[PDB]
Scaffold this active site. Sequence first.
Site, PDB file in Angstrom:
ATOM      1  N   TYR A 232     -14.022   2.496   0.978  1.00 42.95           N
ATOM      2  CA  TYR A 232     -13.351   3.862   2.036  1.00 42.95           C
ATOM      3  C   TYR A 232     -12.704   4.286   1.362  1.00 42.95           C
ATOM      4  O   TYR A 232     -11.776   4.564  -0.364  1.00 42.95           O
ATOM      5  CB  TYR A 232     -11.825   2.807   2.474  1.00 42.95           C
ATOM      6  CG  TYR A 232     -10.415   3.429   3.706  1.00 42.95           C
ATOM      7  CD1 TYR A 232     -10.892   3.549   5.425  1.00 42.95           C
ATOM      8  CD2 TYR A 232      -9.847   3.989   3.432  1.00 42.95           C
ATOM      9  CE1 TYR A 232     -10.103   4.374   6.174  1.00 42.95           C
ATOM     10  CE2 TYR A 232      -8.805   4.702   4.556  1.00 42.95           C
ATOM     11  CZ  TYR A 232     -10.012   4.711   5.960  1.00 42.95           C
ATOM     12  OH  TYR A 232      -8.829   6.075   6.320  1.00 42.95           O
ATOM     13  N   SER A 283       5.120   8.879   1.046  1.00 42.65           N
ATOM     14  CA  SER A 283       4.322   9.036   2.062  1.00 42.65           C
ATOM     15  C   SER A 283       4.580   9.137   3.166  1.00 42.65           C
ATOM     16  O   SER A 283       5.879   8.188   3.224  1.00 42.65           O
ATOM     17  CB  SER A 283       3.431   6.963   2.581  1.00 42.65           C
ATOM     18  OG  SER A 283       4.260   6.127   1.390  1.00 42.65           O
ATOM     19  N   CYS A 285       6.018  11.880   4.841  1.00 41.00           N
ATOM     20  CA  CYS A 285       7.182  12.560   4.152  1.00 41.00           C
ATOM     21  C   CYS A 285       6.687  14.341   4.328  1.00 41.00           C
ATOM     22  O   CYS A 285       7.339  14.730   4.001  1.00 41.00           O
ATOM     23  CB  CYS A 285       6.974  12.506   2.404  1.00 41.00           C
ATOM     24  SG  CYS A 285       9.068  11.527   2.169  1.00 41.00           S
TER      25      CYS A 285
END
Length: 612
Positions: A232, A283, A285
């Site tokens: 990922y 995050s 934001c």
Amino acid sequence: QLHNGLDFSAKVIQGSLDSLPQEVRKFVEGNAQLCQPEYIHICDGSEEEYGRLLAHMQEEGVIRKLKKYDNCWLALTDPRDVARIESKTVIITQEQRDTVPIPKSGQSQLGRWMSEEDFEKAFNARFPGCMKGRTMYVIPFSMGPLGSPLAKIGIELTDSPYVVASMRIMTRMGTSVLEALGDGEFIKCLHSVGCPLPLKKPLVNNWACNPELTLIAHLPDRREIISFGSGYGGNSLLGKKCFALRIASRLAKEEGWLAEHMLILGITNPEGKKKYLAAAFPSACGKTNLAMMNPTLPGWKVECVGDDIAWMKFDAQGNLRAINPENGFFGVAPGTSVKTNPNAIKTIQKNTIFTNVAETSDGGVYWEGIDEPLAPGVTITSWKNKEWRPQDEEPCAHPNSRFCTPASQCPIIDPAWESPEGVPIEGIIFGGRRPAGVPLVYEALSWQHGVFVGAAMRSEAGKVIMHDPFAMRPFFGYNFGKYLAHWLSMAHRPAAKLPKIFHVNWFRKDKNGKFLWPGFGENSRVLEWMFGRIEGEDSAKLTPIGYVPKEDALNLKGLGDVNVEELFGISKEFWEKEVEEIDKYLEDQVNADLPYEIERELRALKQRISQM
Ligand SMILES: [Mn+2]
Ligand SMILES: [Mn+2]
Ligand code: NA
């Protein structure tokens, strides 16, 4: 050789070991010897290589084609492998203190150190034989425009075609990188999903991973990144965070530049004057939103250089010159709409890889906070490969689901986004999500105060407010105290033109939980004020926390009645509490490595608040 097990030439399915530079060959072959891949594929970066790889992934059920769009693809992962895992992310150095400050009372939040002997053990329990029955792909890639003095080359070896495809978009990769490189130095990036053939554990959702053994390691003194067990994003596309933030911020410290978790944007006013701005947000934001914003103010233009990372260095003239080292955008999908980010909508409908979003029956994409009604008849499959209706309590897309899209496709891509010299930064913006107490915008009183403002960043993640200094908390490649020292030292560099530092809060709420600021395109009005302040305009009022806009200084025309007094309210009781917890946090977490000037700035803020 006195036998035939060291020369991996016979296993090369694209390219030649003989044509590679000497040190690249040793890196590839040494790791082939270790990981035992079936095949070695030296990537050329070609369109043919790319399309064929995608169709092969489509063959094996690893990705599926989104028929609604032009060359778009969807990957759905094993639910265990859906994000960067900070708890398995480490930096190895001889001394712990070089990596993280030693906290006073608690455990550190500013990094995770692993001894070299602990790492060697970990590595030995993971990597031998790990690519068995797989192709080892060799990715030569440049972070930054090829031939930029600020660009850095890496070589990533991976057993994941998903990583290859995503890296072609997120970096500049292929044969031209190898020709450019020559006998030069490069960052060594090794990745494996950790699932050698024959598989010993069940394959879930055609997504190879090894959650139990996941480890993302950086060895700056060896210039190595070594990542195992996750396919990922931040764990596997090693150029992005591992390289462009962790490794690079250490090189930066060594060489006198900056590797930052910042968007870069260019903003032009109605008189043709253009300024470049960098911003670091945590995050949820809105970095991508700001970097690609569609301004509402007539005559203004916003153009995108990058949405995540900035490498910045002062030139001979004292200009802070920045490049986006990435080649694409790896943006959060949910909440992306025509309203929130119309320019991203325009970018992602072509040549884009999506991960963990929902799919519509006509072959489109869907996610929470998408602001698009579907035609009657059109049905949704969630990121979990299940039938889904908006009447379920589970989201149709994973909250950390992504689009991966070429930067060149952004309709507002900045004409200097690949200029090798970089763009001159005139302002640096910090910000987070603060429902209370923190004004829409303020300006730091000096460089040292500005560095303090960065250091003190907090953001809403019952709800919890956490510290994320400089938005770099999961990304410091070295001791955060030394990082602050490094920032502070820029003031003592001869000729340096220090950018103005601002702090923003798009997210302040009233007593009923309603956002006090419309945001999105209307943030261009905050940017207008910053532009004027950089130009020396007399548009500010002094407060205990910095300069705020004067009464009537902010262009609020075409907005309704914005509650300006609550938006810009500064309460003594709130700020007393704010400074106390910043003090306790910095003492504990930074401790012996807190620079004198940050202590001073903290004392100064305490004093200013005590006088109101
Ligand atoms: Mn980021
Ligand atoms: Mn100083
Ligand atoms: Na899958």
